[PDB]
Design a binder for this molecule. Structure first.
Ligand SMILES: Nc1ncnc2c1ncn2[C@@H]1O[C@H](COP(=O)(O)OP(=O)(O)OP(=O)(O)O)[C@@H](O)[C@H]1O
Ligand SMILES: Nc1ncnc2c1ncn2[C@@H]1O[C@H](COP(=O)(O)OP(=O)(O)O)[C@@H](O)[C@H]1O
Ligand SMILES: [Mg+2]
Ligand SMILES: [Mg+2]
Lengths: 48, 489, 463, 463
């Protein structure tokens, strides 16, 4: 039993690190998507 | 005059033309110097045209005239085993083609009253596609995947394995550099599969209009046999290149953009092309030929191709194509790199037509492998942890591994109905439970080779008839038992 | 009096008329010398109107003449359009002769007012057990079918219209546009196969046709359903009319395809400015009036496989029931395979359906969800756990899953035209008995391919 | 015949003309006032031509005058250019006197016909472990290197030049487009000291020039190689040719820079509407027809370090062999940074290379894919949980990833270690032994920057 506690606590810490990295990637992708949509809308509205 | 016009603007293959009052839509126009142009926009005071050719020798003030005849291509049975440009001009230099029928390129599909269901198969020579995702005559099936994942190899194998079937094949190449077209044509010639086929080529150096119009001309050439009671099969190397060419030729025409800069009429572009693949009824055949042909039905199957960017199947174009086609075959990079070739994803690939298309023995035998593969998809996550499970899951995982390892086959080696039948029967009846996970391919090859050599009279009966009966079951069992011993792999 | 085309781009055509005579919005014009009809979409001043083409473009050139009918596109309706196939404008395409009727109705009408709504929510009885238990249908509701991964949509609709054909007086309409053509052929031949092709009307729209034809199609199906509902017997009870629409996604896509060229800016992820309005104009006419009731069944495809896209976002705000079926369990052998847990309704309220029905449906849903979370693969040890605590849950889940199976008349294989429209009570009482546990002795395989709780009792007692 | 400048914006100048003498497309014009050569890119009616200026645009006003040469940009060809340095227009820039030849060829011509293509089958061996093992090359083909800034593309191009051109009998053409100048001078002097200058022609257009000069500088090297291919010895056989393009990405980036000023609508991520056609009209002329064989090597730049960008996505299908450079492996200190996955060649099949070669390559790729897939559970959970076979796969993948590293001849300065060369059979033997399992006990720290299986044994003993 004494091993399982440290095993799961290390697993939780690693999960925290991974979620932080994924959050960074998510923010970058979201900003890129918003920029692309706005650019497309403005370009289309210029055409009409 | 009402038929003579001048050129006002020339830019990047698009010509803005004055005059030409009685100019119809899509009607060929004749530039000086033997150049043919289309008409795609008719504004209040100027006409937009695209020049199919080399526009580099057109200037301002060069005259043009209206012909009054829509795009037409030469059709006939002379085009078999030949390589032509989008408009039907031979380019292999083997002499002129004299087919004696000219046909329009833009026509409508048959009505709903004239169509019929799909009851006959179309073999591809691949165990996975032939047992899991069957294709029948008249069906439209889409191959979708990522760069360098075996997408064309499958289509070329499909063309190669219709040697005895008696169905014509048509191949359309869009955007490919001419070296690959030459290589493909040479490979078709080597195996004797070129006698029944025609090739339409619009390479990367060719204008955007050629790559825009190639698939329609291919379909018009393929309809000739369907409307007369013989079958046909058309393959488009990559409608993605065609969509991009349409985007270029439209954006140059000042048409409003949209999602990903693709203008409107993008869904129409692929729908009106993929709707023409259907099976007609014998009454339609009889009426078209005025009684020359009786008691026969025509067909035209399609297998178009579309590529994805790192698995983004949710882009603008793949979703449209996925919504139109009956079935979808997915090729995965993480499967191709793992050695599983052809890399077919079983859990995302479906076919709507289903068992009706397959023969009796195939329809009877595919079920066991289907259910085994389906179950093996579920226990996948618990694969790094074999020790923590009951024996039932162990046996299921083993069987799933064996089945997924039998579905691996080499290129340019089509199997015959009897080969698939024997292999599937050997798998289902638990005759490969004693062999390790490796050497499965060797066992398959050795069994197939032995069965062709010693039980050839049966093999012929299975090939010609495709029936299932107790005698056939007994003979297959006896042969497999004989080979299981007294032989090496 | 007469006008002349001045600009042709795609299917969008600008025509110009004298200063006084300008056709109103949605009026239909005839182009002499061709089969083309023009529908007005916008006015642009100086006597110029944008129009879409009803028919196909047979080489129209600048300067062609056009006269005005001064009335919207009116479809001929009546009792003489029963068992025929007609195009968007009402011409037959089955080569069985012209339609001999005189009653014509415009396809552009306003929705029923506030004071004309029904004064109750009765539920339409159906022979399908699952749709009648865990997702009750509404006699005026507009249900939608998002079930994918299966061609059974046509087969399911065939069973439904056929049981309805017996259950409902008749006069049903099928407005299929932008559909799989061989599926439409299978529809037509199936209806002729069961000798029920009479009393039904069909309107088909081909994908190759210009957006003008691929549009204003459901409108025609809607107009035909209405002439029937308002019909009244000497008694005066109108008819419960049904309507089918194979694809609405194609309707929205045609709108999107023509919007840009009509002078309208892009919005959202690229859709047209007027999405909610264009869908509401259709969805607000499918209502249960005081006299008569129209119900609708529409197959809706979700692009990109998400429920966030604007088109399904505007679609989900109009429905009353959502039915999703998947091959994952259809593979087991249950022919009427519809995902029980996924299905949802705005009529499963305790008061409208009865307290007993509400509680029994909730209990069944809870049992199914419990079995789903406690899979025998979710628990690697498999069986031998929670004896009668979760084991009995597993057995009951198996029994209910098999009892979902229902033999049908259309499937002539292994079945002598059963056509079982099981009484709603019988299903409720059988499920009550199963929940109470009085069937724990019945063999599980006896519960498959069962017509009714009595039927299953006989099947168990024989062996 | 004399025109007046009308508008100057950036590098784009639009110029009027008389009505009957407008110059055609791609012709060249000369400004009388200063040294400038303009190239026609499009016609705009009313006898107005849009043009791109080749050179500086400072000091050019409106109302300047221009004459027309009525012929495209012609460059001198022949053997006179051997061992000389030339501008984009052919002017020498080595301060070694004029070039003595009247043979001029235009730089705008059509691509070879389909009928005269040729099949390339003879193999070519570089000496680099990973290229000669997983992505094999063949004489007369096409090769490409894809990477992002700072990963190793040039140091590999120069190494290939060292291992191939120096030891090959035949001419060579080197064109530099959109790259650093210091590298150009270093290359010129390095070739001079080795007394192999007289076999190489050179063209240089670098990042310091207006986009007009950076846009049409690859075509000049192309024309020179084209003449060197079709030329035949009198009563004698022809010779091989080689072509090196330093960066072809700048060729498209120049068009992207000047696209909007030409009046074209934007598309995708700010790219010009006509991209692939623009890439093809150049990438098709690099061909080995029935007359001669051209072996070209190009380096392709990956913007923002993603391969999904349209520019490196369109170009993937124009090459026979593709080698993809990875920044993660570079940051790991592994050199050269070539990704074993995502690197393919059209000459890896059992017939062309044999059986053992194919089996070795396939097993290597399989092992590396297995490890890459396994990485995630290691990331979350740890190492002890995996099966022992998976631990063995992990160790083998690490050793394989290291063994692909190799010191270079032109990279002694960076690291202070001498260059190395490995025969192909030694690569095959080493990888077969590694996958066999006989080198498991050898520490994985001995597989770094050493060439050949034996040197590894010696290094392992040295530790
Ligand atoms: N069944 C197979 N077994 C082994 N190798 C295969 C198999 N199928 C294809 N390959 C290999 O994969 C490559 C084929 O790639 P493919 O033809 O799909 O290229 P692509 O770029 O995706 O297609 P396109 O023709 O549209 O440009 C070749 O290297 C071929 O040897
Ligand atoms: N094989 C190698 N060994 C050691 N260093 C290298 C190697 N390849 C590249 N480098 C280093 O990486 C840096 C970037 O590589 P280089 O090719 O010069 O630029 P880029 O990657 O932008 O083309 C250089 O400064 C060089 O010293
Ligand atoms: Mg291909
Ligand atoms: Mg760099």
């Amino acid at each position: 039993q004494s091993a399982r506690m440290v095993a799961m606590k290390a697993a939780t810490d690693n999960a925290g690190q991974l979620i932080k990295d994924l959050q960074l990637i998510y923010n970058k992708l979201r900003q890129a998507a918003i920029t692309q949509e706005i650019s497309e809308i403005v370009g289309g509205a210029a055409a009409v | 005059a009402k038929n003579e016009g001048t050129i006002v603007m020339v830019s990047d293959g698009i010509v803005r033309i004055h005059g030409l009052a009685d100019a119809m839509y899509g009607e060929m126009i004749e530039f000086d110097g033997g150049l043919f142009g289309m008409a795609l926009n008719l504004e209040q005071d100027s006409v937009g045209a695209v020049v199919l050719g080399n526009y580099l020798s057109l200037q301002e003030g060069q005259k043009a005239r209206c012909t009054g005849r829509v795009l037409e291509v030469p059709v006939g049975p002379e085009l078999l085993g030949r390589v032509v440009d989008a408009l039907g001009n031979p380019i292999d230099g083997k002499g002129p083609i004299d087919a004696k029928l000219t046909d329009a390129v833009e026509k409508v599909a048959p009505g709903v009253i004239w169509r019929q269901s799909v009851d006959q198969p179309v073999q591809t020579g691949y165990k996975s596609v032939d047992t899991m995702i069957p294709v029948g005559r008249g069906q439209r099936e889409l191959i979708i995947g990522d760069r360098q994942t075996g997408k064309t190899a499958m289509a070329i194998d499909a063309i190669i394995a219709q040697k005895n079937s008696g169905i014509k094949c048509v191949y359309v190449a869009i955007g490919q550099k001419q070296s690959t077209i030459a290589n493909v044509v040479r490979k078709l010639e080597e195996t004797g599969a070129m006698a029944y086929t025609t090739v339409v080529a619009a390479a990367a150096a060719d204008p955007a209009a050629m790559q825009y119009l190639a698939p329609y001309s291919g379909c018009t050439m393929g309809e000739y046999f369907r409307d007369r009671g013989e079958d046909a099969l058309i393959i488009y190397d990559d409608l993605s290149k065609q969509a991009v060419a349409y985007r270029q030729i439209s954006l140059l025409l000042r048409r409003p953009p949209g999602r990903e800069a693709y203008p409107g009429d993008v869904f129409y572009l692929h729908s009106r092309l993929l709707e023409r693949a259907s099976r007609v009824s014998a009454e339609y055949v009889e009426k078209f030929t005025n009684g020359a042909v009786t008691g026969k039905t025509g067909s035209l199957t399609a297998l178009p191709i579309i590529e994805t960017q790192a698995g983004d199947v949710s882009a603008f174009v793949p979703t449209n194509v996925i919504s139109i086609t009956d079935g979808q075959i997915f090729l995965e990079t993480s499967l191709f790199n793992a050695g599983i070739r052809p890399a077919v994803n079983a859990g995302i690939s479906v076919s709507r037509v289903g068992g009706s298309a397959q023969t009796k023995i195939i329809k009877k035998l595919s079920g066991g492998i289907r259910t085994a593969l389906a179950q093996y998809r579920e226990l996948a996550a618990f694969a790094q942890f074999a020790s923590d499970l009951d024996e039932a899951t162990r046996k299921q995982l083993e069987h799933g591994q064996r089945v997924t390892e039998l579905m691996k086959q080499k290129q340019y080696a089509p199997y015959s109905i009897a080969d698939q039948a024997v292999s599937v029967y050997a798998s289902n009846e638990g005759y490969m439970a004693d062999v390790e996970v490796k050497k499965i391919v060797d066992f398959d090859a050795a069994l197939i080779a032995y069965f062709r050599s010693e039980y050839a009279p049966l093999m012929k009966q299975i090939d010609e008839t495709g029936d299932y009966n107790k005698d056939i079951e007994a003979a297959i069992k006896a042969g497999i038992e004989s080979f299981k011993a007294t032989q090496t792999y | 009096s007469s006008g002349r085309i001045i600009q042709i781009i795609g299917a969008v055509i600008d025509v110009e008329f004298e200063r006084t005579s300008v056709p109103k919005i949605y009026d239909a014009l005839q182009v002499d010398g061709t089969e083309t009809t023009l529908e007005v979409q916008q006015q642009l001043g100086d006597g110029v109107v944008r129009t879409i083409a009803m028919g196909s473009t047979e080489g129209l050139k600048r300067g062609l003449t056009v006269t005005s009918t001064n009335a919207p596109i009116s479809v001929p309706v009546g009792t003489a359009t029963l068992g025929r196939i007609m195009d968007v404008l009402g011409r037959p395409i089955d080569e069985a002769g012209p339609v001999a009727t005189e009653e014509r109705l415009p396809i552009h009408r306003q929705a029923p007012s506030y004071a004309e709504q029904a004064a109750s929510t009765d539920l339409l009885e159906t022979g399908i057990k699952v749709i009648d238990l865990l997702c009750p249908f509404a006699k005026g509701g507009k249900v939608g079918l998002f079930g994918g991964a299966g061609v059974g949509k046509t087969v399911n609709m065939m069973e439904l219209i056929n049981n309805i054909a017996k259950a409902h007086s008749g006069l049903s309409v099928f407005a299929g546009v932008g559909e799989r053509t061989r599926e439409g052929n299978d529809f037509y031949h199936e209806m002729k196969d069961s000798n029920v092709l009479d009393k039904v009307a069909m309107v088909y729209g081909q994908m190759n046709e210009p957006p003008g034809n691929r549009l204003r199609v459901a409108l025609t199906g809607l107009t035909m359903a209405e002439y029937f509902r308002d019909e009244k017997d000497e008694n005066g009870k109108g008819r419960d009319v049904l309507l089918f629409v194979d694809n609405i996604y194609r309707y929205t896509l045609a709108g999107t395809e023509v919007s840009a060229l009509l002078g309208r800016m892009p919005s959202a992820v690229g859709y047209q400015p007027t999405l909610a309005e264009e869908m509401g104009v259709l969805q607000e006419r499918i209502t249960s009036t005081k006299s008569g009731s129209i119900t609708s069944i529409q197959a809706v495809y979700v692009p990109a496989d998400d429920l966030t896209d604007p088109s399904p976002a505007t679609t989900f705000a109009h429905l009353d029931a959502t039915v999703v079926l998947s091959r994952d369990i259809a593979s087991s052998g249950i022919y009427p395979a519809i995902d029980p847990l996924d299905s949802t309704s705005r009529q499963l309220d305790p008061l409208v359906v009865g307290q007993e029905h509400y509680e029994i449906a909730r209990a069944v849903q809870n049992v199914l969800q419990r079995y789903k979370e406690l899979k025998d693969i979710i628990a690697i040890l498999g069986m031998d756990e929670l004896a009668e605590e979760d084991k009995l849950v597993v057995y009951r889940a198996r029994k209910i899953q098999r009892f979902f199976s229902q033999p049908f008349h259309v499937a002539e294989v292994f079945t002598g035209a059963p056509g079982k429209l099981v009484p709603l009570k019988e299903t409720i009482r059988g499920f009550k008995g199963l929940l109470a546990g009085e069937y724990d002795h019945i063999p599980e395989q006896a519960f498959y391919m069962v017509g009714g709780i009595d039927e299953v009792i006989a099947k168990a007692e024989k062996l």
